């Protein structure tokens, strides 16, 4: 048992059954550990017990550092910490303040975290002091009996969750109790404003170049347009880490007698190594939609349909190539790919950039807008269908979100 | 010093100071507790030690249960467990099997978890039996008094660190990124090569902070962990321009008479304005794959299945909400969203980052690796299934591609 | 321009320069086509023309029909039909009642359709007389100049619809005008009731045999269970025409150095040769769900997860095998398949029949029911997930629909 | 008789009951019409017939067109149409090119279809140009007095057949099936072999009736065609227990201010209750792919695209309707559905039977056949895409598999 009392200048704690070990260890090392949190020298003991007196019969009295300036001063050596600690009179000195549950040295953990050598002060009129109410809040937050039991139940539950059925939901209860506690402070966060500003600077530059190319560049060929957009594709689509050109694939459907080589003009490699196809096509007023609806339904134009068919054919040829194709593609592009990465077909999908939307023009009526959205999601293989005006709108939305 | 042997298909535990007290306690309470894990009735004791017999030369013998059908059947009363305890014959009986570290009853914690009274079975082909390898993992990863103290030391340190400096390590990494960004961007004008170098610095910064969070911020609450990754989610997934928290959806399936409001902890909005869901789960469980394959095929862990189920339930409610949901969400988040963008619930999908694959260890076999890849792609509404280790590898692949 | 008048109680047709040609044709052959709908002869001429008389001055006079009992009787030869035609006095006599637009013989078409040789009767009190109201309705149904123009516009529209892209969508106009006029009679539709009763008999026989196996034949092993279900699998799922057993599949992912053979126990071939996998598993109470929900979400049981994974592995191996797999499978099963059918892997999907819902014997909570439905529609490859109780419910629904 | 020659890059047509009268008609009307297809003004005549010249000795020469830019430009006045007609130089000018059988101008009908004043262009690489092969298909299929008369005769025959014994041919096929069913099932005890034989008879009956409808009664209204196939829809797709006609759905996207009612012509409800959509399109063309490939890729025809678009729009409205849709649909069709079964919109899918592939002809090339299959599987939200010939082939495959 530990009883804490203050007499005049010094504050003395009393250890209250076999205390023979304490005396022996105190003699052996000139230091004993009381409750794993107190380190006292033979000098610290107010009176050494006589070898003739029974150590168990003797009541041990260990002395803390002298209190002054209305603050109890406790030596660093007793807590085995470099910085000494100051405790206010208003807090009643006790073991709960010194140690948390499981004999955790609250002051010791605090000392390791604090790089400054300035002595810790609690509930003091001094500016560098812990608010007493907040210090009590930290004590409540520290793990307590039954919080450890919830963690223990959760750890065993996680190991046998599949193996054992009928086990109580220990993990859910432990997480819920932990969720009520909020270790992090919302005010102390990372602004990340400079990083966001650089992202805006990157998005604006890509948006400005593509917009300028639509406005003034029509002379350049479709292949020249592909080359212009090839650097931007990696930044517009960060999921695809590498861009591959003229990817030869093998055909076993167009000609049964002999394989026919097919060349994907632009292909995309995911960080996972999955393979996707991107089709870049010359922008036109209406290369994405027709002029007259069929049977009261707007339909995709020959240009868009042909572009979807080209990408669909390449995906179909890759799906047939399967594992053999991945090995051939991996060996051909191993240097291009980051080391430890292999191309995997993984059900290839296609990204299409055809024409410019008339929504910006305002020519498209609400019924046309509905059909335009449906044409965009009509094909599963074409995960995303985009128009150059739509791509600019997506860039504008991303820039606005970063700005806000 | 306990020795376990089987006589006539009946298990016998033999124990070998003064053991006279053990006989006195057995008579006084009709029971004795030995090692703090085993309780034996006076009837249970195999041989009564007579007073004339020398206790020093006598070794206590107690029935430890009966070996039936190749299964050792320790009585529940011995471990003070309401349900029976069964061990396989191949698993050698030891004090370590029943007690971990400082006399911690391993079976006791498992019994508290099991609401059902069905007997615990360890080893063998029994359907409810726990595999010997999993039981060995449970012994090693059991929350022993030392492990509980380690958790308490970590939790106390985390609470003090969060109050003292918040995300100090993340801020230091951000300051390093800012210095690198200034060196790379000597000129205000931006080039594609300059943008790629800035992207490498941004990706390294995000990856370094995530690794630091995994190493020291794991003990944080699930709500606190989501807050740490919420700014990074927009950067890790640029497609999703905005991140929304505590989104409210309507559930009519659970109670037809009255709708029940459900809350999505994190939701992602893309530039198109389509709504998707993201789940960031604290990696409490070390493995995202079950230790033993159910039938030569590795199966998803309960933690992975739970995260998938919770997201699927959210996606199901969003699809059911339909147009009414899009209008309600758009009005609620109109200020948050960039102007001219409306929340549309079309084809809602989910991205889940849960647990750690630890392919770095190399424990996974070629078949196990194949099963893990199939599980990542097995779920229809989870476009990306990720683990914290997998996310770090994807970040590394992006950095290498930008470098080359 | 033909005029019909009654002289001597008989109809007279007057024909209004081709008049000289008609006289020359009358000399060459007795039969002369007037308006392409009427055949007339020298005997029919009331007043035959002569060369000396001016043809232009002369007015043709013919005997059209003889009126008997106040009913006009028209000979078969004039309309070139075997049976005579009767016209009621009240019904006007003109070219339009005799012929539709484009000189289409209404009576000639009707005579071919009528198997009976009884003379066609229009109006009058005769038992088989066609009512005047009905005859006028038939005339309105017959195509007019506007419908012929609309059909002509529709025919040209379809040929160049993709090319010009500037047409007025005349197809939609023509189809809409056609839709307003329905020439079918609701009574004519086949009862098909006798066939539907036979379908109920087939469904009841399958339902009862599956039911008898569930409740009584639990003795059969899983291989024995699959064998009993294989004949029913085609009937339960008619889309899959053929059942393949022990289908050898080349596997490269499990062991890269050496290919490994995976044997799909039951495989299904679509009429188009598409390949699907069916997994028949022994039924058990529940076995589609875990007893305890994980974090308030019920998760798939280990047995269900293992079954889904095994089917997913077979689908994954087939996709990797790709076109080479299709050729190998076609060669192995060409004899079993109908001639002209080749096994095309395409996108392989799996149908899983595992466990029992447990809903009927013990009511499940609404959350359990929602999770059970979600699990079935969770995995993409598992298009259909069923329980034996679900199969009986599906059979009951089909039987009830056929009854009603 | 008309001869076209190219002198000095100018196209001139020469012709040879008196030509002098034609010259007089030019003085009377300031214009003349020749062959009923060509109208020539006074300026058009290349060389005037001098009185001294024997009108007969001179051959009436008229300037027909100007040859410029490697093209033959024909003035609109010559064809009496507002828009000019351009014929490629490689295409020989013939009366057949500008005139169908019995002087039916081919260009005049096309001019009526085209709302825009842009000139019709035939041959060449221009996108607005119509391919020569398609123009040859137009010439052969162009409506002419014979073709229109043939359509009118067939329509009149169908109207009379609808009036008397509409489904008489179908009744005869059903009677044959009933006689065959009696011969097969004499035991009165269902057997798997007996069921297979009954299934073959049911499949043959459906296949024969569908084949008869293709051959005759095709001219019937699209609504009549849907009603004809509506009983067989459940038999063709047995998973779908019930068929719903004119299913009202709520559309909010088309008009923001108010919802607009949309009717699904035919909707399919399965045993689960998952509502699906089937489109039955009356075949009007023998091509489901464009006659000329877009850049070596065969695009889907307008009819196929329009039917898919209509199904996609219905699926989109159902997904937006969500839970509200499930309630309204279930209440409206609760009596129609088996008791205890409710419509669940879930993910709507569409089945489309449109036009005829004519694969049986063998006209399609291997690349065209590959494009055909890819188009059927390239559309999301579609379970399958079917043609009437493809549906018959599927029925044949089921019959052969049942036989063995
Ligand atoms: Mg979460
Ligand atoms: Mg329709």
| The three-state (H, E, C) secondary structure of C338-369, written as one string | CCCCCCEEEEEEEEEECCCCCCCCCCCCHHHH
C304 and C170: one domain?
no
- In this structure, is residue C201 part of a structural domain? yes
In angstroms, rounded to a whole number, what is the distance separating the alpha carbons of residues C147 and B359? 73
Q: List the CATH number of the domain containing D382.
A: 3.40.1350
Experimental technique of record? cryo-EM
Neighbours of B161 (CB within 10 A): 22
Q: Is D319 on the interface with B (CB under 8 A)?
A: yes
- Count Cβ–Cβ pairs < 8 Å, chain B vs chain C: 84
D299 and D384: one domain?
yes
Tokens of D123: 């041959």
- In this structure, is residue D92 part of a structural domain? yes
In angstroms, rounded to a whole number, what is the distance separating the alpha carbons of residues C347 and C337? 19
- In this structure, is residue D138 part of a structural domain? yes
* CA neighbor of A355 nearest in space, from A314, A389, A399: A389
The beta-carbon neighbor of D319 closest among B252, B253, B322 is B322
Sequence-separated (6 or more) residues with CB below 8 Å from residue C129: C86, C88, C121, C122, C123
Give C172-177's long-range contacts (Cβ < 8 A, gap of 24+): C172/A294, C172/A295, C172/A296, C174/C147, C174/C150, C175/A295, C175/D221, C175/D222, C175/D282, C177/C147, C177/C150
| DSSP-derived secondary structure letter, C3 | E
Structural contact between residues D152 and D143, judged by C-beta atoms closer than 8 angstroms: no
Instruction: Give the gyration radius of chain C's Cα atoms.
Output: 37
Q: Scan for tokens 């709507």, then name that residue.
A: D348
In angstroms, rounded to a whole number, what is the distance separating the alpha carbons of residues C345 and D195? 29
| DSSP-derived secondary structure letter, C99 | B
C70 and C211: one domain?
no
In angstroms, rounded to a whole number, what is the distance separating the alpha carbons of residues C55 and B242? 94
The Å distance, Cα A341 to ligand 1 centre, comes to: 30
Sequence-separated (6 or more) residues with CB below 8 Å from residue C394: C386, D271, D272
Tokens of A176: 């819920």
Tokens of D13: 């047509």
Tokens of C117: 């040789």
Q: Is D40 left (phi over 0), alpha (psi -120 to 50) or beta?
A: beta
* CA neighbor of B242 nearest in space, from B311, B327, B344, B337: B337
In angstroms, rounded to a whole number, what is the distance separating the alpha carbons of residues C386 and C288? 9
Q: Is B192 left (phi over 0), alpha (psi -120 to 50) or beta?
A: alpha
B185 and B267: one domain?
no
In angstroms, rounded to a whole number, what is the distance separating the alpha carbons of residues B385 and B289? 13
- In this structure, is residue A23 part of a structural domain? yes
D391 and D254: one domain?
yes
In angstroms, rounded to a whole number, what is the distance separating the alpha carbons of residues C10 and C3? 14
Tokens of D236: 């063709």
Tokens of B157: 């340190």
Q: How far apart, in Å, are the Cα atoms of C6 and each of B66, C14, C61?
A: 122, 11, 12
Contact D306 A312 (CB under 8 A): no
Distance from the Cα of residue D182 to its chain's centroid: 41
| DSSP-derived secondary structure letter, C250 | E
Between CA A222 and CA A229, with CA A227 as vertex, the angle to 5 degrees is 95
Contact B305 C305 (CB under 8 A): yes
Q: Is D216 left (phi over 0), alpha (psi -120 to 50) or beta?
A: beta
- In this structure, is residue A139 part of a structural domain? no
In angstroms, rounded to a whole number, what is the distance separating the alpha carbons of residues C43 and C59? 16
Contact C381 B378 (CB under 8 A): yes
Give D167-170's long-range contacts (Cβ < 8 A, gap of 24+): D167/C188, D167/C189, D167/C190, D167/D228, D169/D209, D169/D212, D169/D216, D170/C190, D170/D209, D170/D212
Grouping H, G, I as helix, E, B as strand and the rest as coil, residue A278 is strand
Q: How far apart, in Å, are the Cα atoms of B199 and each of B148, B183, B208, B211, B403?
A: 42, 14, 14, 18, 10
Q: Is B192 on the interface with D (CB under 8 A)?
A: no
Q: Is C235 on the interface with B (CB under 8 A)?
A: no
Pairing of strands B384-386, D71-74: unpaired
Q: Scan for tokens 């996680």, then name that residue.
A: A158
Tokens of B272: 């198109």
The Å distance, Cα B279 to ligand 1 centre, comes to: 5
> Residues A123-141, buried b or exposed e (16+ Cβ, 10 A)?
bbeeeebbeeeebeebeeb
Pairing of strands B31-34, B10-15: unpaired
* CA neighbor of B267 nearest in space, from B277, B259, B254, B281: B277
Instruction: List the end-to-end C-alpha distance of chain B, in Å, as a whole number.
Output: 64
In angstroms, rounded to a whole number, what is the distance separating the alpha carbons of residues B6 and B63? 9
Give the helix/strand (H/E) hosting C97. helix C95-98
Structural contact between residues C174 and C154, judged by C-beta atoms closer than 8 angstroms: yes
| Strands of A10-15's sheet in order across | A2-7, A10-15, A60-63
Tokens of A299: 């339909």
Give D160-164's long-range contacts (Cβ < 8 A, gap of 24+): D160/C109, D160/C110, D160/C113, D160/C138, D161/C113, D161/D217, D162/C183, D162/C184, D162/C185, D162/C188, D162/D220, D162/D224, D163/C134, D163/C138, D163/C183, D163/C185, D164/C113, D164/C114
In angstroms, rounded to a whole number, what is the distance separating the alpha carbons of residues D401 and C335? 11
Q: Output the CA torsion sign for A187, A190, A196, A197.
A: positive
Tokens of D39: 């109208």
> Residues C306-336, buried b or exposed e (16+ Cβ, 10 A)?
bbbbbbbbbbbbbbbbbbbbbeebeeebeee
Q: How far apart, in Å, are the Cα atoms of B403 and each of B72, B201, B205?
A: 61, 11, 15
Pairing of strands D60-68, B38-41: unpaired
- Name beta bridge partners: A61: A14
* CA neighbor of B248 nearest in space, from B257, B235, B259: B259
Pairing of strands A240-251, D275-281: unpaired
Pairing of strands D120-122, D129-130: parallel
Pairing of strands A120-122, A85-88: parallel
Number of domains composing chain D:
3
C127 and C208: one domain?
no
Grouping H, G, I as helix, E, B as strand and the rest as coil, residue D244 is strand
Q: How far apart, in Å, are the Cα atoms of C167 and each of A49, C160, D289, D291?
A: 115, 9, 19, 18
The beta-carbon neighbor of D324 closest among B253, B324, B326 is B324
Contacts of D310 in chain A (CB under 8 A): 295, 297
Structural contact between residues B222 and B231, judged by C-beta atoms closer than 8 angstroms: no
Give the helix/strand (H/E) hosting B99. strand B99-100
Domain boundary among D81, D110, D143: D143
* CA neighbor of D203 nearest in space, from D402, D404, D50, D1: D402
- Name beta bridge partners: A31: none
Task: Give a three-class secondary structure readout of D123-192.
Answer: CCCCCCEECHHHHHHHHHHCCCHHHHHHHHHHHHHHHHHHHCCCCHHHHHHHHHHHHHHHHHCCCCCCCH
In angstroms, rounded to a whole number, what is the distance separating the alpha carbons of residues C220 and B342? 58
B44 and B19: one domain?
yes
In angstroms, rounded to a whole number, what is the distance separating the alpha carbons of residues D106 and D108? 6
* CA neighbor of C77 nearest in space, from C125, C118, C41, C112: C41
In angstroms, rounded to a whole number, what is the distance separating the alpha carbons of residues C356 and B328? 40
Between CA C81 and CA C87, with CA C86 as vertex, the angle to 5 degrees is 125
Q: What is the DSSP string of A160-182?
A: HTTT-SSB--HHHHHHHHHHHS-
Pairing of strands C344-353, D10-15: unpaired
Q: What is the DSSP string of A198-255?
A: HHHHHHHHHHHHHHHHHHH--SS-HHHHHHHHHHHHHHH-TTEEEEEEEEEEEESSS-
- In this structure, is residue D21 part of a structural domain? yes
For residue C57, count CB atoms less than 10 angstroms from its CB and return exposed for 0-12, middle for 13-18, buried for 19 or more: exposed
* CA neighbor of A242 nearest in space, from A278, A210, A279, A213: A278
In angstroms, rounded to a whole number, what is the distance separating the alpha carbons of residues C270 and C278? 12
Q: For residue B353, how many C-alpha atoms fall within 13 Å in the half-sphere facing its CB?
A: 21
Structural contact between residues A112 and B165, judged by C-beta atoms closer than 8 angstroms: no
Domain boundary among B220, B244, B270: B220
Q: Is C303 on the interface with B (CB under 8 A)?
A: yes
Q: What is the DSSP string of B346-386?
A: SS--EEEEES---TTT--S-HHHHHHHHHHHHHBSS-SEEE
Structural contact between residues A248 and A263, judged by C-beta atoms closer than 8 angstroms: yes
In angstroms, rounded to a whole number, what is the distance separating the alpha carbons of residues D13 and D4? 5
A352 and A306: one domain?
yes
Q: Is C181 on the interface with D (CB under 8 A)?
A: yes
Interrupted after residues, chain B (C–N over 2.5 Å): 16
Distance from CA of B272 to the nearest CA of C (A): 25
Q: How far apart, in Å, are the Cα atoms of A122 and each of A80, A95, A134, A364?
A: 19, 15, 10, 70
In angstroms, rounded to a whole number, what is the distance separating the alpha carbons of residues C227 and C282? 12
Give the helix/strand (H/E) hosting C226. helix C222-236
Q: Is C305 on the interface with B (CB under 8 A)?
A: yes
Structural contact between residues A178 and A381, judged by C-beta atoms closer than 8 angstroms: no
Neighbours of D355 (CB within 10 A): 24
Q: Is D69 left (phi over 0), alpha (psi -120 to 50) or beta?
A: left
For residue B378, count CB atoms less than 10 angstroms from its CB and return exposed for 0-12, middle for 13-18, buried for 19 or more: buried
Structural contact between residues A307 and A297, judged by C-beta atoms closer than 8 angstroms: no
The values of phi and psi at residue B7, to 5°, are -120, 125
Distance from the Cα of residue A374 to its chain's centroid: 35
Tokens of C192: 């098909």
- Could you tell me how many helices (H) and strands (E) chain C has, helices first? 12, 14
The values of phi and psi at residue A156, to 5°, are -65, -40
Sequence-separated (6 or more) residues with CB below 8 Å from residue C133: none
Interrupted after residues, chain C (C–N over 2.5 Å): 16
Pairing of strands B350-354, B38-41: unpaired
B197 and B242: one domain?
no
Sequence-separated (6 or more) residues with CB below 8 Å from residue D70: D88, D89, D124
Determine which of B284, B302, B347, B382 to mutate to test the interface with C (most C C-beta atoms within 10 Å). Answer: B302
Give the helix/strand (H/E) hosting C47. strand C45-47
Domain boundary among B179, B198, B220: B220
A229 and A298: one domain?
yes
Sequence-separated (6 or more) residues with CB below 8 Å from residue A7: none
In angstroms, rounded to a whole number, what is the distance separating the alpha carbons of residues D104 and D144? 6
Q: Is B187 on the interface with C (CB under 8 A)?
A: no
Contacts of A296 in chain C (CB under 8 A): 169, 172
Contact B160 A377 (CB under 8 A): no
Structural contact between residues A22 and A38, judged by C-beta atoms closer than 8 angstroms: no
Contacts of A299 in chain D (CB under 8 A): 302, 305-306, 309
B37 and B157: one domain?
no
Q: How far apart, in Å, are the Cα atoms of C320 and each of A314, B21, B370, C251, C347?
A: 16, 73, 13, 8, 11
Q: Most distant CA pair in chain B: distance in Å?
A: 101
In angstroms, rounded to a whole number, what is the distance separating the alpha carbons of residues B398 and C5? 97
* CA neighbor of B329 nearest in space, from B383, B279, B261, B382: B261
- Name beta bridge partners: C13: C4, C62
Structural contact between residues D387 and D288, judged by C-beta atoms closer than 8 angstroms: yes
Structural contact between residues A359 and A367, judged by C-beta atoms closer than 8 angstroms: no
Tokens of D298: 């065969």
In angstroms, rounded to a whole number, what is the distance separating the alpha carbons of residues A371 and C292? 47
Structural contact between residues C65 and C88, judged by C-beta atoms closer than 8 angstroms: no
- In this structure, is residue A188 part of a structural domain? no
- Count Cβ–Cβ pairs < 8 Å, chain A vs chain C: 68
- In this structure, is residue D154 part of a structural domain? no
In angstroms, rounded to a whole number, what is the distance separating the alpha carbons of residues C86 and C84? 7
| DSSP-derived secondary structure letter, C185 | -
Contacts of C134 in chain D (CB under 8 A): 163
C276 and C393: one domain?
yes
Contacts of A249 in chain C (CB under 8 A): none
Q: Which domain holds residue D192?
A: 162-220
* CA neighbor of A347 nearest in space, from C320, C270, B368: C320
């Amino acid at each position: 048992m530990l009883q804490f009392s203050f007499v005049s200048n010094d504050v003395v704690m009393t250890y209250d059954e076999q205390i023979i070990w304490v005396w022996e260890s105190l003699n052996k090392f000139q230091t004993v550990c009381i409750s794993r949190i107190f380190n006292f020298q033979l000098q610290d003991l107010r009176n050494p017990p006589s070898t003739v007196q029974d150590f168990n019969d003797y009541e041990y009295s260990f002395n803390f550092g002298t209190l002054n300036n209305e603050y109890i001063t406790v030596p660093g050596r007793i807590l085995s910490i470099n910085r000494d600690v100051l405790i206010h009179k208003s807090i009643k000195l006790e073991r709960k303040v010194f140690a948390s549950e499981r004999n955790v040295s609250i002051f010791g953990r605090l000392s390791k975290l604090l790089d400054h050598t300035n002595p810790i002060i609690i509930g003091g009129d001094k500016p560098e002091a812990i608010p007493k109410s907040v210090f009590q809040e930290l004590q409540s937050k520290f793990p307590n009996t039954g919080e450890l039991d919830r963690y223990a139940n959760a750890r065993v539950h996680a190991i046998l969750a599949g193996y054992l059925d009928g086990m109580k939901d220990a993990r859910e209860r432990y997480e819920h109790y932990l969720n009520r506690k909020t270790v992090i402070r919302k005010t102390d966060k990372l602004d990340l404003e400079v990083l966001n500003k650089l992202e805006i600077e990157k998005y604006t530059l890509i948006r400005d170049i593509i917009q300028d190319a639509l406005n003034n560049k029509t002379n350049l060929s479709e292949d020249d347009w592909q080359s212009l957009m090839i650097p931007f594709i990696t930044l517009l689509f960060p999921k695809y880490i590498k861009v591959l050109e003229k990817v030869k694939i093998f055909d076993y459907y167009s000609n049964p007698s002999a394989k026919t080589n097919r060349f994907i003009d632009i292909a995309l490699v995911d960080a996972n190594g999955n393979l996707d196809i991107i089709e870049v096509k010359k922008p036109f007023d209406d290369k994405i939609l027709r002029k007259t609806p069929y049977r009261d339904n707007y339909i995709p134009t020959s240009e868009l349909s042909g572009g979807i068919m080209q990408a669909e054919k390449y995906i179909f040829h890759l799906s047939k190539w399967g594992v053999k194709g991945e090995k051939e593609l991996t060996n051909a592009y191993k240097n291009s790919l980051p080391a430890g990465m292999c191309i995997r077909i993984s059900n290839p999908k296609a990204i299409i950039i055809v024409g410019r939307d008339q929504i910006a023009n305002g020519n498209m009526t609400d019924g046309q807008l509905l059909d335009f959205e449906i044409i965009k999601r009509k094909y599963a293989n074409m995960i995303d269908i985009l128009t150059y005006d739509d791509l600019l709108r997506r860039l504008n939305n991303t820039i606005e979100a970063l700005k806000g």
